[PDB]
Amino acid sequence: SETITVPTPIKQIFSDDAFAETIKDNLKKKSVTDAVTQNELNSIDQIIANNSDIKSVQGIQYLPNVTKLFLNGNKLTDIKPLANLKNLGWLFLDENKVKDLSSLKDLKKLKSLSLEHNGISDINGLVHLPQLESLYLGNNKITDITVLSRLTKLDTLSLEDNQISDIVPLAGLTKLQNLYLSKNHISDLRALAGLKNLDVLELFSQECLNKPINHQSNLVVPNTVKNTDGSLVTPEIISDDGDYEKPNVKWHLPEFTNEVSFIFYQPVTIGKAKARFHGRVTQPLKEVYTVSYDVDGTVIKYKVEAGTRITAPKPPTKQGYVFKGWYTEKNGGHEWNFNTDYMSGNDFTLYAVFKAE
């Protein structure tokens, strides 16, 4: 059960020493040894216990009327004791390690939820809280916010300092008024174009990472940074002395380098909200050269990354002759060993050598 029928010492119900002291102070008792009644436990509407070294709230099940719980900055990992607090409307759990959200499933009066700095990546359990009005998820490990398209009553939402690139799930959340998206992986603002009720919008310090491409002396990278109307954002500064020739960023790279980048900056206005959309696009580069195989003057070419293993060709054949291997010159040089001789740091040709039977 989750009710007491006799006066019971606080510390017998609340075994975490810090949380027992919290309840002692809440009920204005002298000591955690003091006995309390269910009537007294029924009177608790709000608990404030931030920065209190609490490891477990076991015992809170006995507080059926609690509507507000402030537990930022503790050592919590499990919220199963909250599962049947059906009147909970405010739940603040910043700076804990609460990742299992299954026990929120039946908290259908919850309107404000805060879970910043909890190491969270999976937020699919929030599908059970479509009535949420304020949601704070800053400083986590989130990439997939698909579930938020169902949280259509949100007017206040923080997702800052995560790893999000796809914000299309926010496109239909027209009640949004305060929206915090700085320090993500956002390069494309089209999803925000229909958010007419914004008053506070933050979009600074995005970090966007392209898939690697091969280095070239005359490198061309498409600009992929898009404003709310789809137009391309002009770069603010380009690495390695490159330049912009819309829609492409271009570089002259005579020597290999394993990365180039550019920074963008765009003042944005969405409804009433003004923001600075800004960040960096990083382009990793692979060092790739070509091995050419020459059989009696006919050549086929393969691209291979420097310092990696080359796969041998099909052995050539020539009637009246025996193939003797691939050599570094047509009439001289030395034989290539594909298991030990990895790809050189430059283009080169190997030549088939034959011997008469």
Side-chain angles (χ1 to χ4, degrees), residues 90-124:
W90 290 254
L91 177 55
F92 286 70
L93 288 163
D94 296 347
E95 290 276 4
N96 289 279
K97 297 178 188 179
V98 177
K99 293 184 193 183
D100 180 3
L101 305 186
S102 62
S103 284
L104 305 174
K105 171 176 184 174
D106 295 305
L107 302 182
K108 300 298 189 184
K109 291 181 191 67
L110 194 59
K111 291 178 179 174
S112 198
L113 177 62
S114 204
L115 283 160
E116 306 208 322
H117 295 274
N118 274 264
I120 291 167
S121 58
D122 184 0
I123 53 165
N124 289 327

PDB file of all heavy atoms in Angstrom, residues 90-124:
ATOM      1  N   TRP A  90       4.228  19.833 -12.063  1.00  0.00           N
ATOM      2  CA  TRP A  90       5.550  20.431 -12.211  1.00  0.00           C
ATOM      3  C   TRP A  90       6.583  19.410 -11.750  1.00  0.00           C
ATOM      4  O   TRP A  90       6.544  18.988 -10.588  1.00  0.00           O
ATOM      5  CB  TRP A  90       5.685  21.704 -11.358  1.00  0.00           C
ATOM      6  CG  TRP A  90       4.896  22.875 -11.797  1.00  0.00           C
ATOM      7  CD1 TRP A  90       5.367  24.007 -12.402  1.00  0.00           C
ATOM      8  CD2 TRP A  90       3.480  23.070 -11.633  1.00  0.00           C
ATOM      9  NE1 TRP A  90       4.334  24.884 -12.631  1.00  0.00           N
ATOM     10  CE2 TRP A  90       3.166  24.330 -12.180  1.00  0.00           C
ATOM     11  CE3 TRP A  90       2.453  22.291 -11.096  1.00  0.00           C
ATOM     12  CZ2 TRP A  90       1.866  24.834 -12.197  1.00  0.00           C
ATOM     13  CZ3 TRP A  90       1.163  22.789 -11.120  1.00  0.00           C
ATOM     14  CH2 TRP A  90       0.882  24.049 -11.669  1.00  0.00           C
ATOM     15  N   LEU A  91       7.529  19.048 -12.635  1.00  0.00           N
ATOM     16  CA  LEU A  91       8.577  18.088 -12.290  1.00  0.00           C
ATOM     17  C   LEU A  91       9.905  18.606 -12.823  1.00  0.00           C
ATOM     18  O   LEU A  91      10.117  18.619 -14.043  1.00  0.00           O
ATOM     19  CB  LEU A  91       8.268  16.700 -12.842  1.00  0.00           C
ATOM     20  CG  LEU A  91       9.352  15.628 -12.601  1.00  0.00           C
ATOM     21  CD1 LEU A  91       9.690  15.503 -11.098  1.00  0.00           C
ATOM     22  CD2 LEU A  91       8.923  14.278 -13.127  1.00  0.00           C
ATOM     23  N   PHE A  92      10.809  18.986 -11.919  1.00  0.00           N
ATOM     24  CA  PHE A  92      12.109  19.548 -12.282  1.00  0.00           C
ATOM     25  C   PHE A  92      13.216  18.643 -11.761  1.00  0.00           C
ATOM     26  O   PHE A  92      13.371  18.477 -10.545  1.00  0.00           O
ATOM     27  CB  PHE A  92      12.242  20.968 -11.753  1.00  0.00           C
ATOM     28  CG  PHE A  92      11.428  21.967 -12.542  1.00  0.00           C
ATOM     29  CD1 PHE A  92      10.044  21.961 -12.470  1.00  0.00           C
ATOM     30  CD2 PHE A  92      12.047  22.883 -13.374  1.00  0.00           C
ATOM     31  CE1 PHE A  92       9.289  22.872 -13.203  1.00  0.00           C
ATOM     32  CE2 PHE A  92      11.298  23.790 -14.109  1.00  0.00           C
ATOM     33  CZ  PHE A  92       9.927  23.782 -14.022  1.00  0.00           C
ATOM     34  N   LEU A  93      13.986  18.068 -12.692  1.00  0.00           N
ATOM     35  CA  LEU A  93      14.988  17.035 -12.432  1.00  0.00           C
ATOM     36  C   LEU A  93      16.310  17.341 -13.136  1.00  0.00           C
ATOM     37  O   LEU A  93      17.063  16.423 -13.491  1.00  0.00           O
ATOM     38  CB  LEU A  93      14.465  15.667 -12.865  1.00  0.00           C
ATOM     39  CG  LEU A  93      13.373  15.034 -12.000  1.00  0.00           C
ATOM     40  CD1 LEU A  93      12.665  13.912 -12.764  1.00  0.00           C
ATOM     41  CD2 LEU A  93      13.974  14.492 -10.691  1.00  0.00           C
ATOM     42  N   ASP A  94      16.627  18.616 -13.341  1.00  0.00           N
ATOM     43  CA  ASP A  94      17.908  18.942 -13.980  1.00  0.00           C
ATOM     44  C   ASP A  94      19.056  18.337 -13.176  1.00  0.00           C
ATOM     45  O   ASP A  94      18.976  18.187 -11.952  1.00  0.00           O
ATOM     46  CB  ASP A  94      18.127  20.460 -14.069  1.00  0.00           C
ATOM     47  CG  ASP A  94      17.104  21.178 -14.949  1.00  0.00           C
ATOM     48  OD1 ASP A  94      16.346  20.531 -15.714  1.00  0.00           O
ATOM     49  OD2 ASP A  94      17.069  22.430 -14.871  1.00  0.00           O
ATOM     50  N   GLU A  95      20.151  18.016 -13.870  1.00  0.00           N
ATOM     51  CA  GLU A  95      21.394  17.601 -13.235  1.00  0.00           C
ATOM     52  C   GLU A  95      21.151  16.419 -12.299  1.00  0.00           C
ATOM     53  O   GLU A  95      21.424  16.470 -11.097  1.00  0.00           O
ATOM     54  CB  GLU A  95      22.056  18.767 -12.493  1.00  0.00           C
ATOM     55  CG  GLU A  95      22.622  19.858 -13.428  1.00  0.00           C
ATOM     56  CD  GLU A  95      24.022  19.531 -13.952  1.00  0.00           C
ATOM     57  OE1 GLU A  95      24.537  18.425 -13.656  1.00  0.00           O
ATOM     58  OE2 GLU A  95      24.613  20.382 -14.667  1.00  0.00           O
ATOM     59  N   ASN A  96      20.588  15.372 -12.887  1.00  0.00           N
ATOM     60  CA  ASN A  96      20.539  14.041 -12.298  1.00  0.00           C
ATOM     61  C   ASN A  96      20.996  13.087 -13.403  1.00  0.00           C
ATOM     62  O   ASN A  96      21.617  13.494 -14.394  1.00  0.00           O
ATOM     63  CB  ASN A  96      19.132  13.739 -11.752  1.00  0.00           C
ATOM     64  CG  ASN A  96      18.810  14.541 -10.509  1.00  0.00           C
ATOM     65  OD1 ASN A  96      19.211  14.185  -9.388  1.00  0.00           O
ATOM     66  ND2 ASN A  96      18.064  15.628 -10.688  1.00  0.00           N
ATOM     67  N   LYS A  97      20.712  11.796 -13.242  1.00  0.00           N
ATOM     68  CA  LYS A  97      20.959  10.809 -14.294  1.00  0.00           C
ATOM     69  C   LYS A  97      19.710   9.970 -14.528  1.00  0.00           C
ATOM     70  O   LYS A  97      19.741   8.734 -14.511  1.00  0.00           O
ATOM     71  CB  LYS A  97      22.144   9.910 -13.948  1.00  0.00           C
ATOM     72  CG  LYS A  97      23.467  10.641 -13.823  1.00  0.00           C
ATOM     73  CD  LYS A  97      24.592   9.671 -13.432  1.00  0.00           C
ATOM     74  CE  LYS A  97      25.889  10.406 -13.121  1.00  0.00           C
ATOM     75  NZ  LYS A  97      26.982   9.471 -12.721  1.00  0.00           N
ATOM     76  N   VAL A  98      18.590  10.647 -14.750  1.00  0.00           N
ATOM     77  CA  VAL A  98      17.308   9.997 -14.992  1.00  0.00           C
ATOM     78  C   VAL A  98      17.157   9.818 -16.501  1.00  0.00           C
ATOM     79  O   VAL A  98      16.939  10.791 -17.228  1.00  0.00           O
ATOM     80  CB  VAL A  98      16.148  10.816 -14.413  1.00  0.00           C
ATOM     81  CG1 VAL A  98      14.807  10.155 -14.750  1.00  0.00           C
ATOM     82  CG2 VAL A  98      16.317  10.949 -12.908  1.00  0.00           C
ATOM     83  N   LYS A  99      17.254   8.574 -16.964  1.00  0.00           N
ATOM     84  CA  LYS A  99      17.088   8.258 -18.379  1.00  0.00           C
ATOM     85  C   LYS A  99      15.856   7.423 -18.674  1.00  0.00           C
ATOM     86  O   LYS A  99      15.263   7.572 -19.741  1.00  0.00           O
ATOM     87  CB  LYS A  99      18.312   7.497 -18.908  1.00  0.00           C
ATOM     88  CG  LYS A  99      19.582   8.312 -18.949  1.00  0.00           C
ATOM     89  CD  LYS A  99      20.720   7.523 -19.563  1.00  0.00           C
ATOM     90  CE  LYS A  99      22.047   8.199 -19.314  1.00  0.00           C
ATOM     91  NZ  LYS A  99      23.173   7.467 -19.972  1.00  0.00           N
ATOM     92  N   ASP A 100      15.470   6.535 -17.764  1.00  0.00           N
ATOM     93  CA  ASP A 100      14.267   5.727 -17.936  1.00  0.00           C
ATOM     94  C   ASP A 100      13.067   6.611 -17.626  1.00  0.00           C
ATOM     95  O   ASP A 100      12.843   6.966 -16.475  1.00  0.00           O
ATOM     96  CB  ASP A 100      14.308   4.508 -17.016  1.00  0.00           C
ATOM     97  CG  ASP A 100      13.075   3.623 -17.146  1.00  0.00           C
ATOM     98  OD1 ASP A 100      12.200   3.908 -17.994  1.00  0.00           O
ATOM     99  OD2 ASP A 100      12.989   2.619 -16.393  1.00  0.00           O
ATOM    100  N   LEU A 101      12.306   6.968 -18.654  1.00  0.00           N
ATOM    101  CA  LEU A 101      11.166   7.855 -18.497  1.00  0.00           C
ATOM    102  C   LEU A 101       9.845   7.101 -18.455  1.00  0.00           C
ATOM    103  O   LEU A 101       8.787   7.737 -18.461  1.00  0.00           O
ATOM    104  CB  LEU A 101      11.149   8.877 -19.631  1.00  0.00           C
ATOM    105  CG  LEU A 101      12.430   9.695 -19.786  1.00  0.00           C
ATOM    106  CD1 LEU A 101      12.233  10.770 -20.846  1.00  0.00           C
ATOM    107  CD2 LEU A 101      12.866  10.314 -18.472  1.00  0.00           C
ATOM    108  N   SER A 102       9.883   5.762 -18.383  1.00  0.00           N
ATOM    109  CA  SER A 102       8.647   4.988 -18.466  1.00  0.00           C
ATOM    110  C   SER A 102       7.677   5.332 -17.333  1.00  0.00           C
ATOM    111  O   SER A 102       6.455   5.245 -17.516  1.00  0.00           O
ATOM    112  CB  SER A 102       8.968   3.488 -18.464  1.00  0.00           C
ATOM    113  OG  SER A 102       9.607   3.125 -17.256  1.00  0.00           O
ATOM    114  N   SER A 103       8.187   5.722 -16.168  1.00  0.00           N
ATOM    115  CA  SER A 103       7.316   6.003 -15.033  1.00  0.00           C
ATOM    116  C   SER A 103       6.580   7.330 -15.149  1.00  0.00           C
ATOM    117  O   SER A 103       5.747   7.634 -14.279  1.00  0.00           O
ATOM    118  CB  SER A 103       8.123   5.968 -13.732  1.00  0.00           C
ATOM    119  OG  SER A 103       8.392   4.627 -13.364  1.00  0.00           O
ATOM    120  N   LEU A 104       6.855   8.124 -16.183  1.00  0.00           N
ATOM    121  CA  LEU A 104       6.056   9.317 -16.449  1.00  0.00           C
ATOM    122  C   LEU A 104       4.756   8.986 -17.173  1.00  0.00           C
ATOM    123  O   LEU A 104       3.900   9.868 -17.307  1.00  0.00           O
ATOM    124  CB  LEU A 104       6.860  10.312 -17.294  1.00  0.00           C
ATOM    125  CG  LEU A 104       8.218  10.750 -16.757  1.00  0.00           C
ATOM    126  CD1 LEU A 104       8.946  11.624 -17.771  1.00  0.00           C
ATOM    127  CD2 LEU A 104       8.057  11.488 -15.443  1.00  0.00           C
ATOM    128  N   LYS A 105       4.593   7.730 -17.612  1.00  0.00           N
ATOM    129  CA  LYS A 105       3.564   7.378 -18.590  1.00  0.00           C
ATOM    130  C   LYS A 105       2.179   7.873 -18.201  1.00  0.00           C
ATOM    131  O   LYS A 105       1.419   8.338 -19.060  1.00  0.00           O
ATOM    132  CB  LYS A 105       3.538   5.854 -18.777  1.00  0.00           C
ATOM    133  CG  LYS A 105       2.367   5.347 -19.593  1.00  0.00           C
ATOM    134  CD  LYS A 105       2.445   3.847 -19.821  1.00  0.00           C
ATOM    135  CE  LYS A 105       1.306   3.375 -20.724  1.00  0.00           C
ATOM    136  NZ  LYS A 105       1.419   1.938 -21.094  1.00  0.00           N
ATOM    137  N   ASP A 106       1.812   7.745 -16.928  1.00  0.00           N
ATOM    138  CA  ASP A 106       0.458   8.031 -16.466  1.00  0.00           C
ATOM    139  C   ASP A 106       0.370   9.329 -15.670  1.00  0.00           C
ATOM    140  O   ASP A 106      -0.537   9.488 -14.852  1.00  0.00           O
ATOM    141  CB  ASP A 106      -0.063   6.856 -15.633  1.00  0.00           C
ATOM    142  CG  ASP A 106      -0.223   5.587 -16.463  1.00  0.00           C
ATOM    143  OD1 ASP A 106      -0.927   5.644 -17.486  1.00  0.00           O
ATOM    144  OD2 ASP A 106       0.367   4.548 -16.099  1.00  0.00           O
ATOM    145  N   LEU A 107       1.293  10.261 -15.897  1.00  0.00           N
ATOM    146  CA  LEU A 107       1.229  11.583 -15.279  1.00  0.00           C
ATOM    147  C   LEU A 107       0.579  12.570 -16.248  1.00  0.00           C
ATOM    148  O   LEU A 107       1.231  13.430 -16.839  1.00  0.00           O
ATOM    149  CB  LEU A 107       2.624  12.045 -14.882  1.00  0.00           C
ATOM    150  CG  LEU A 107       3.390  11.133 -13.930  1.00  0.00           C
ATOM    151  CD1 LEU A 107       4.733  11.769 -13.606  1.00  0.00           C
ATOM    152  CD2 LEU A 107       2.600  10.848 -12.659  1.00  0.00           C
ATOM    153  N   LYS A 108      -0.741  12.430 -16.391  1.00  0.00           N
ATOM    154  CA  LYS A 108      -1.482  13.148 -17.420  1.00  0.00           C
ATOM    155  C   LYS A 108      -1.850  14.581 -17.032  1.00  0.00           C
ATOM    156  O   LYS A 108      -2.467  15.282 -17.851  1.00  0.00           O
ATOM    157  CB  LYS A 108      -2.758  12.371 -17.773  1.00  0.00           C
ATOM    158  CG  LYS A 108      -2.496  10.972 -18.295  1.00  0.00           C
ATOM    159  CD  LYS A 108      -1.693  10.995 -19.589  1.00  0.00           C
ATOM    160  CE  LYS A 108      -1.629   9.606 -20.219  1.00  0.00           C
ATOM    161  NZ  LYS A 108      -0.771   9.574 -21.426  1.00  0.00           N
ATOM    162  N   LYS A 109      -1.503  15.029 -15.828  1.00  0.00           N
ATOM    163  CA  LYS A 109      -1.624  16.436 -15.455  1.00  0.00           C
ATOM    164  C   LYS A 109      -0.286  17.175 -15.505  1.00  0.00           C
ATOM    165  O   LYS A 109      -0.234  18.374 -15.201  1.00  0.00           O
ATOM    166  CB  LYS A 109      -2.232  16.555 -14.055  1.00  0.00           C
ATOM    167  CG  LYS A 109      -3.694  16.126 -13.993  1.00  0.00           C
ATOM    168  CD  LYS A 109      -4.272  16.290 -12.598  1.00  0.00           C
ATOM    169  CE  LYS A 109      -5.620  15.610 -12.483  1.00  0.00           C
ATOM    170  NZ  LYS A 109      -5.510  14.128 -12.586  1.00  0.00           N
ATOM    171  N   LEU A 110       0.789  16.498 -15.894  1.00  0.00           N
ATOM    172  CA  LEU A 110       2.100  17.126 -15.926  1.00  0.00           C
ATOM    173  C   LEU A 110       2.132  18.177 -17.026  1.00  0.00           C
ATOM    174  O   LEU A 110       1.912  17.862 -18.202  1.00  0.00           O
ATOM    175  CB  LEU A 110       3.170  16.054 -16.146  1.00  0.00           C
ATOM    176  CG  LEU A 110       4.624  16.421 -15.897  1.00  0.00           C
ATOM    177  CD1 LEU A 110       4.850  16.885 -14.482  1.00  0.00           C
ATOM    178  CD2 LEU A 110       5.480  15.197 -16.197  1.00  0.00           C
ATOM    179  N   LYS A 111       2.407  19.429 -16.652  1.00  0.00           N
ATOM    180  CA  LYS A 111       2.444  20.521 -17.621  1.00  0.00           C
ATOM    181  C   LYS A 111       3.824  21.138 -17.800  1.00  0.00           C
ATOM    182  O   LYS A 111       4.077  21.744 -18.851  1.00  0.00           O
ATOM    183  CB  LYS A 111       1.450  21.617 -17.218  1.00  0.00           C
ATOM    184  CG  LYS A 111       0.006  21.186 -17.350  1.00  0.00           C
ATOM    185  CD  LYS A 111      -0.943  22.279 -16.908  1.00  0.00           C
ATOM    186  CE  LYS A 111      -2.394  21.840 -17.067  1.00  0.00           C
ATOM    187  NZ  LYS A 111      -3.345  22.839 -16.504  1.00  0.00           N
ATOM    188  N   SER A 112       4.712  20.997 -16.815  1.00  0.00           N
ATOM    189  CA  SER A 112       6.072  21.519 -16.886  1.00  0.00           C
ATOM    190  C   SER A 112       7.029  20.401 -16.496  1.00  0.00           C
ATOM    191  O   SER A 112       6.906  19.833 -15.401  1.00  0.00           O
ATOM    192  CB  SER A 112       6.236  22.733 -15.964  1.00  0.00           C
ATOM    193  OG  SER A 112       7.382  23.495 -16.301  1.00  0.00           O
ATOM    194  N   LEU A 113       7.973  20.087 -17.386  1.00  0.00           N
ATOM    195  CA  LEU A 113       8.946  19.025 -17.190  1.00  0.00           C
ATOM    196  C   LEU A 113      10.333  19.540 -17.538  1.00  0.00           C
ATOM    197  O   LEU A 113      10.533  20.093 -18.633  1.00  0.00           O
ATOM    198  CB  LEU A 113       8.621  17.795 -18.056  1.00  0.00           C
ATOM    199  CG  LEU A 113       9.625  16.648 -17.990  1.00  0.00           C
ATOM    200  CD1 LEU A 113       9.694  16.091 -16.541  1.00  0.00           C
ATOM    201  CD2 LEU A 113       9.274  15.559 -18.968  1.00  0.00           C
ATOM    202  N   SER A 114      11.293  19.336 -16.634  1.00  0.00           N
ATOM    203  CA  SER A 114      12.669  19.775 -16.847  1.00  0.00           C
ATOM    204  C   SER A 114      13.630  18.625 -16.594  1.00  0.00           C
ATOM    205  O   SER A 114      13.651  18.055 -15.496  1.00  0.00           O
ATOM    206  CB  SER A 114      12.998  20.968 -15.946  1.00  0.00           C
ATOM    207  OG  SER A 114      14.052  21.758 -16.472  1.00  0.00           O
ATOM    208  N   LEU A 115      14.458  18.313 -17.591  1.00  0.00           N
ATOM    209  CA  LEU A 115      15.358  17.165 -17.559  1.00  0.00           C
ATOM    210  C   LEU A 115      16.709  17.521 -18.178  1.00  0.00           C
ATOM    211  O   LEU A 115      17.339  16.706 -18.865  1.00  0.00           O
ATOM    212  CB  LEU A 115      14.749  15.970 -18.294  1.00  0.00           C
ATOM    213  CG  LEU A 115      13.661  15.205 -17.538  1.00  0.00           C
ATOM    214  CD1 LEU A 115      12.817  14.381 -18.509  1.00  0.00           C
ATOM    215  CD2 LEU A 115      14.318  14.322 -16.484  1.00  0.00           C
ATOM    216  N   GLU A 116      17.181  18.733 -17.928  1.00  0.00           N
ATOM    217  CA  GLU A 116      18.454  19.169 -18.488  1.00  0.00           C
ATOM    218  C   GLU A 116      19.621  18.482 -17.772  1.00  0.00           C
ATOM    219  O   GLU A 116      19.536  18.127 -16.601  1.00  0.00           O
ATOM    220  CB  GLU A 116      18.582  20.683 -18.391  1.00  0.00           C
ATOM    221  CG  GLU A 116      17.385  21.428 -19.024  1.00  0.00           C
ATOM    222  CD  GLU A 116      17.734  22.813 -19.549  1.00  0.00           C
ATOM    223  OE1 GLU A 116      18.540  23.535 -18.902  1.00  0.00           O
ATOM    224  OE2 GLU A 116      17.195  23.187 -20.613  1.00  0.00           O
ATOM    225  N   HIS A 117      20.711  18.250 -18.513  1.00  0.00           N
ATOM    226  CA  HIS A 117      21.924  17.677 -17.930  1.00  0.00           C
ATOM    227  C   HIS A 117      21.652  16.311 -17.289  1.00  0.00           C
ATOM    228  O   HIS A 117      22.034  16.060 -16.143  1.00  0.00           O
ATOM    229  CB  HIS A 117      22.543  18.617 -16.886  1.00  0.00           C
ATOM    230  CG  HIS A 117      23.056  19.915 -17.421  1.00  0.00           C
ATOM    231  ND1 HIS A 117      24.327  20.057 -17.935  1.00  0.00           N
ATOM    232  CD2 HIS A 117      22.495  21.152 -17.459  1.00  0.00           C
ATOM    233  CE1 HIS A 117      24.514  21.314 -18.304  1.00  0.00           C
ATOM    234  NE2 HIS A 117      23.418  21.999 -18.024  1.00  0.00           N
ATOM    235  N   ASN A 118      20.971  15.423 -18.019  1.00  0.00           N
ATOM    236  CA  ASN A 118      20.720  14.066 -17.521  1.00  0.00           C
ATOM    237  C   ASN A 118      21.330  12.987 -18.411  1.00  0.00           C
ATOM    238  O   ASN A 118      21.126  11.793 -18.153  1.00  0.00           O
ATOM    239  CB  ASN A 118      19.208  13.822 -17.351  1.00  0.00           C
ATOM    240  CG  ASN A 118      18.682  14.303 -15.998  1.00  0.00           C
ATOM    241  OD1 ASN A 118      18.568  13.522 -15.048  1.00  0.00           O
ATOM    242  ND2 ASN A 118      18.376  15.596 -15.899  1.00  0.00           N
ATOM    243  N   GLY A 119      22.110  13.370 -19.417  1.00  0.00           N
ATOM    244  CA  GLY A 119      22.720  12.394 -20.313  1.00  0.00           C
ATOM    245  C   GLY A 119      21.732  11.656 -21.187  1.00  0.00           C
ATOM    246  O   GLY A 119      22.025  10.544 -21.652  1.00  0.00           O
ATOM    247  N   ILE A 120      20.564  12.251 -21.429  1.00  0.00           N
ATOM    248  CA  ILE A 120      19.483  11.611 -22.171  1.00  0.00           C
ATOM    249  C   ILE A 120      19.757  11.666 -23.671  1.00  0.00           C
ATOM    250  O   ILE A 120      20.227  12.680 -24.200  1.00  0.00           O
ATOM    251  CB  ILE A 120      18.151  12.315 -21.835  1.00  0.00           C
ATOM    252  CG1 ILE A 120      17.762  12.015 -20.385  1.00  0.00           C
ATOM    253  CG2 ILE A 120      17.058  11.916 -22.828  1.00  0.00           C
ATOM    254  CD1 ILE A 120      16.618  12.921 -19.841  1.00  0.00           C
ATOM    255  N   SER A 121      19.429  10.574 -24.365  1.00  0.00           N
ATOM    256  CA  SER A 121      19.323  10.565 -25.822  1.00  0.00           C
ATOM    257  C   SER A 121      17.947  10.150 -26.316  1.00  0.00           C
ATOM    258  O   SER A 121      17.452  10.716 -27.297  1.00  0.00           O
ATOM    259  CB  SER A 121      20.381   9.634 -26.421  1.00  0.00           C
ATOM    260  OG  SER A 121      20.269   8.309 -25.926  1.00  0.00           O
ATOM    261  N   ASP A 122      17.296   9.198 -25.645  1.00  0.00           N
ATOM    262  CA  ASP A 122      16.006   8.659 -26.070  1.00  0.00           C
ATOM    263  C   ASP A 122      14.896   9.391 -25.336  1.00  0.00           C
ATOM    264  O   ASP A 122      14.774   9.270 -24.109  1.00  0.00           O
ATOM    265  CB  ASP A 122      15.945   7.156 -25.787  1.00  0.00           C
ATOM    266  CG  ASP A 122      14.672   6.508 -26.303  1.00  0.00           C
ATOM    267  OD1 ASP A 122      13.829   7.217 -26.891  1.00  0.00           O
ATOM    268  OD2 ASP A 122      14.520   5.280 -26.120  1.00  0.00           O
ATOM    269  N   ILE A 123      14.083  10.152 -26.077  1.00  0.00           N
ATOM    270  CA  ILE A 123      12.955  10.862 -25.484  1.00  0.00           C
ATOM    271  C   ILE A 123      11.615  10.323 -25.991  1.00  0.00           C
ATOM    272  O   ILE A 123      10.590  10.998 -25.869  1.00  0.00           O
ATOM    273  CB  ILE A 123      13.039  12.387 -25.703  1.00  0.00           C
ATOM    274  CG1 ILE A 123      13.235  12.724 -27.188  1.00  0.00           C
ATOM    275  CG2 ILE A 123      14.134  13.008 -24.849  1.00  0.00           C
ATOM    276  CD1 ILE A 123      12.967  14.212 -27.512  1.00  0.00           C
ATOM    277  N   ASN A 124      11.589   9.099 -26.521  1.00  0.00           N
ATOM    278  CA  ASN A 124      10.345   8.576 -27.068  1.00  0.00           C
ATOM    279  C   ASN A 124       9.286   8.350 -25.996  1.00  0.00           C
ATOM    280  O   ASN A 124       8.095   8.290 -26.322  1.00  0.00           O
ATOM    281  CB  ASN A 124      10.621   7.283 -27.832  1.00  0.00           C
ATOM    282  CG  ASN A 124      11.360   7.530 -29.146  1.00  0.00           C
ATOM    283  OD1 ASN A 124      11.160   8.556 -29.809  1.00  0.00           O
ATOM    284  ND2 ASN A 124      12.213   6.592 -29.527  1.00  0.00           N
TER     285      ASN A 124
END
